[PDB]
Amino acid sequence: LGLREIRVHLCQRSPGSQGVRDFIVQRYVELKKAHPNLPILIRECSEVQPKLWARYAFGQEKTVSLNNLSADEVTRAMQNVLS
Amino acid sequence: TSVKPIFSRDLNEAKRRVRELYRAWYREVPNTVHLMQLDITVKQGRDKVREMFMKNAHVTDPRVVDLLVIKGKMELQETIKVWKQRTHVMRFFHETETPRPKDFLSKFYMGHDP
Amino acid sequence: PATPEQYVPYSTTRKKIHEWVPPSTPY
Amino acid sequence: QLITVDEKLDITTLTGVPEEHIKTRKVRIFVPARNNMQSGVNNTKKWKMEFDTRERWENPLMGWASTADPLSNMVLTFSAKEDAIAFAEKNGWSYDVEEKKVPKPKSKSYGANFSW
Amino acid sequence: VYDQVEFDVPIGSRGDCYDRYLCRVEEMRQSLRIIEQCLNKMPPGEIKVDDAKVSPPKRAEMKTSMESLIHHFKLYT
Amino acid sequence: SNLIEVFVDGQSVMVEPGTTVLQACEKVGMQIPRFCYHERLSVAGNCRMCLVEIEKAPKVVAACAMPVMKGWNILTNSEKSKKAREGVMEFLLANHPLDCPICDQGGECDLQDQSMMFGSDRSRFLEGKRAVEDKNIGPLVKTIMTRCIQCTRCIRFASEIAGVDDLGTTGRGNDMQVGTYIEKMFMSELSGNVIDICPVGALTSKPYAFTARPWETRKTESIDVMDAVGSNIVVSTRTGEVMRILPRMHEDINEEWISDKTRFAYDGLKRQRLTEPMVRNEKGLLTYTSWEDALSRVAGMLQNFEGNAVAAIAGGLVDAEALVALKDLLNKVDSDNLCTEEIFPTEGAGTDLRSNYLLNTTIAGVEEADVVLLVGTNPRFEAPLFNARIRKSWLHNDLKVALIGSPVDLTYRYDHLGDSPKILQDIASGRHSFCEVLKDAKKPMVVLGSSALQRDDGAAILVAVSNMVQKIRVTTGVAAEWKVMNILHRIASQVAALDLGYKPGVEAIRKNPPKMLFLLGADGGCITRQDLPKDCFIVYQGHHGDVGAPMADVILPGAAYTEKSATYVNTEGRAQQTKVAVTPPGLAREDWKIIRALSEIAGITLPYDTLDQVRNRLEEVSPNLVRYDDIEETNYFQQASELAKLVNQEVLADPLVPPQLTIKDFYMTDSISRASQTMAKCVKAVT
Amino acid sequence: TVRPRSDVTHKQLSAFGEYVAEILPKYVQQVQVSCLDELEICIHPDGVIPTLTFLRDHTNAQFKSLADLTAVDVPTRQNRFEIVYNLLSLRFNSRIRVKTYADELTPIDSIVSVHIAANWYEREVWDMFGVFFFNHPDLRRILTDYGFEGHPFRKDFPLTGYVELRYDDEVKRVVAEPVELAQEFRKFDLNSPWEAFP
Amino acid sequence: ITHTGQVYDEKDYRRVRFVDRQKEVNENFAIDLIAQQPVNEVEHRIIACDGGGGALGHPKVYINLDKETKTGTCGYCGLQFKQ
Ligand code: SF4
Ligand code: SF4
Ligand code: FES
Ligand SMILES: [Zn+2]
């Protein structure tokens, strides 16, 4: 229903996370500006393919695995969630 | 990896023993109730037997099933004979013990232990 | 060189805990 | 002979431990830490597998501490992480291995405290 | 110190309860022979090895010398 | 390879030049019997109980001070080095008073053992013993110093770890007594460590005077929750009540030392403690009632109230597991007004990139720094075992400490740049003198204590510091993994809260008042019934009745960190696990379950039903909570600065002042401490 | 305070240990005369009947009586149980220890054929530790209760068990009950942390 | 009330025990009997205290009656010694 927060869990040093890391270095600074106070809790993965969670209105959440997903892809994936 | 067999080589081979025990027990429950003047009904008891033979129904290491039979048979010997009194056999029925609840709310509501 | 005086045990321990006593008057 | 099997040798059904003490109970493999009160390091060399701490209550009549955790005074002692994880897996308990914490080498010199 | 006391083992034939009874009655008699030697030849000395690490220190010593208090405390605890 | 080769009874180990003979024996595995030698204390050679015999050498050498040379074989179990111990132990024991059944370091004696293993079966001292005069060093240390073996560990600790040089030796001969010449109490944090460090039971703990004896004490290894350094500790429990908390060694966090607060406030844990779930009744008095009734009081109000009418002000010592069980519940009724009492500026990336709010340089990094600019905190009384870190690195290494706060007792020589938040701008401009000092620093670090952030211009103070860290980093050209910006906390449940996604500050609750508030261990005055809607339905979830209890429509007692397998995380994000030392008292229950149960009565049941499951939940919200004893490095700072640059705020001229100005400020700071009789005795001693 | 000992024995027995190791190379893994002047021949579990038969019936080593059969359980070792057989030679006035290793699920053979003394000891090892003896006549619980579940002397078994008994009037029988002890057994952590110089 | 408290609160159900019975309580409190003893005056700076016995008393400890300000008290007998 209504996005309440988006937690991007990205491994720190792996091919999979690679690019996800890029998203942060290329767009987080802007995403936060664009849609501020949208809790975006970027946190760390542990040898677990990068994932993007997102709470919604009433305890609802969705997962999207982005292992080896490239940068641009992530960018959109974030934009898709905060449609 | 390789392991010496206790008595059976393949799980299937062993199960042959597991069934040769089930039958034995089944054909014995009736006798016990009468001999040990137990009060539970033949049907009731025979239920217990299946339960147990069933409780162990998940192991796949033949050596373990080769071992539980033995322990299993031993328990018959005693029960077939009256080496075990009523007290012993009836202990399989938790007559006094109040079955512990499992629902979380049912446990949270009583006892700090999980 | 029936008797009433029967030993009865205690817990001679000073109770080892203290519960919050709730506030006396309401708010 | 030499049959082959692929299990973690769960002898949980040969052990004889009541289910609830094999299911809801977590062993904690760890190398005991030193008693700060003493400086002997002979009690921090072998890995121990102790179980969870359940209710320790008071006997109403005499005030003693009573308990219903049969596996409360249990502290199995192994000689390596490998041999403790194996036993816990063997018996069907859940484990929480804690890596050893040997002091690192700290360089000590008598003269150093005389510099100015 | 049995190596220093003299006694005769009472062996028996016809391994039957009786021969076994007779042997038990003889060992009681042979034990009186060993008890006789022990009373006749018991040496003056102390009754416990006195390296305090193994056997506890004497009551007077633990109450007057520190090494003995430490050895009593550690041995008992 | 500068290893030099030396023989330990033949094992022929190879060691760095400059390792002591005692150290050489350690790597082979042999232990030299030792007194007056502590690993993190200077070598003194006072006892000489460690005499060993290097080979084909004339005399015995002190393993604590002799640098091992090339090809010296140490003979640790020779016929000589045993007469060198059988004869020293003769002396230590000769003047010793035999009150081992008084000395509560009975089984915790490094002098009976060494006597009982390496010393002598008998005594030859047929003469008269000596006696010294018991003095008062404080209300925490009982110095029955007739016990003292003049090993000078105390004097050193007091001078090298704690910078308080009050203790000292007085007199020569056999009446050298190591006590303060004038009777001035040894008042300092880090004080209680003397107990643990004196191997003799001369000075021991006064509260734990005679309550127990060590063989009985069952020892459970857990985590310090009183302060945010998260010091490792061992809780010694006998027959189910905690008897003493003593340090256990963690190289990185507390290396064998714990604070005075987190060792003598175990007594506070046993009184004023909530146990049964009372519910306001009758005229308003709280009345003890069964869980079922108290829980549905709360559940019924929860079903009635919608989102943003239900809020949670958590804070203090609540664990991560309760914090996720309280968020998952209030989101299942769609209020994300979950908040913490300590306000961390969120006017930025805020709580979003851990780099923002975590001492980035680890506690152990303070050892490698080159200059530290502490701004806004009295590290001493906020995080004592981090003040010690800067203590050791200012002594053994050469840290140049600079404080922008109140000039305050820091146990070391700092440079007081000033008491003004705007002079932070002065360094950013390069105007102030220390600007070059940092320019000269190859590995500098900046520390901003949350205690500053808690003022109104805290958002501006964080932004101003981030600007200076930015050009400090640019001017120094410091390498990326070296991390200049870090901020230290003083509340155990802050970092975890912030990580789990809890938004700091009660500012949101202030603007819109919630019909129902579930205070979760909050004893702070951040909101009051006076500041709430008229309905003001509020339910305290905690362990000690202090401020939140008497203004509470429901009391749901919880546990304390001695009584649950919860997780906490200190300031550089190292998650750590408390183990259950004692079962929780009364009907009191673990914090996570109360909230799982309330959810079941409410009907929005939470998914987990066992704690491993809640640990799996934590993995979903923040994944470095399921990971213990690990500090993770991803310095998402550069983007943090960009948002800091966007934020515009004014740093008011009011000087930034740490709330704990002097040590009486420190003793009592939390429920488990404000209830401490020992802390109370300490407070009046200072006053 | 130093035992009065004879070196003759250490040597004589050491020599027998080499003799047994030479005569049976296939089953003996390690032979050692301890300093208590006793001998221990450690055999592969398969050598239990060959090694003991050679000792029971060899002119130069007659070991007619089985003093005892016991199983130390070192939980660490992979093969936890260490069955130990102590044997006595009336002819040569000397004693020997043959010890082999058995795991929870790998049974070892039964020596009842070699010595009929073992018929009972092997039943006690099964009841106490759970080691199973192959082709053993009548193996069944010697010491534990008829319905006992679990092998008691295993180091992983709680001192006080899991079940206790009481008479329940309502059922008029001696009923079992999960163990609740009125005073837990204070476990004393008495063990010094300063090791002894060897 | 025993020398160490223990007195049951009126409401305590733990009082039935003493019904048709009574309470074993020693009337001779050692807190007071030891106070009903003369401070042992001495000449020497330090004094011994074998517990009034050799091997029938308590371990022998030497007390420093060095300050009249405080009468040394052997930790075993609670006997105050007046310099
Ligand atoms: S210190 Fe206390 S315990 Fe250790 S010896 Fe001296 S008196 Fe006995
Ligand atoms: S007090 Fe403890 S530490 Fe200080 S000198 Fe005497 S013994 Fe050594
Ligand atoms: S320990 Fe070597 S000098 Fe005291
Ligand atoms: Zn006295």
Side-chain angles (χ1 to χ4, degrees), chain F residues 36 105 143 145 147-156 167 169 178 194-195 197-203:
Chain F
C36 55
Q105 291 181 359
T143 58
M145 184 176 282
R147 293 182 183 174
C148 205
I149 53 152
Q150 285 89 10
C151 68
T152 79
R153 278 202 200 180
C154 43
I155 291 184
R156 292 167 294 179
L167 283 163
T169 42
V178 175
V194 195
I195 292 104
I197 288 166
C198 181
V200 175
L203 61 85

Side-chain angles (χ1 to χ4, degrees), chain F residues 22 32-38 43-51 61-65 151:
Chain F
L22 188 147
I32 304 301
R34 66 184 182 277
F35 281 126
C36 55
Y37 168 65
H38 186 279
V43 159
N46 292 284
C47 71
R48 300 296 299 278
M49 168 47 199
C50 72
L51 287 167
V61 300
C64 288
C151 68

Side-chain angles (χ1 to χ4, degrees), chain F residues 309-313 509 514-519 527 532 537-539:
Chain F
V310 192
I313 295 193
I509 303 301
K515 300 296 183 181
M516 176 178 73
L517 177 63
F518 307 69
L519 289 186
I527 62 100
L532 285 180
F537 184 76
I538 61 171
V539 296

Side-chain angles (χ1 to χ4, degrees), chain F residues 171-186:
Chain F
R172 59 176 182 183
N174 220 344
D175 66 9
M176 185 160 87
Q177 63 180 20
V178 175
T180 60
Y181 177 77
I182 45 182
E183 293 177 350
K184 62 180 68 180
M185 66 174 282
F186 187 51

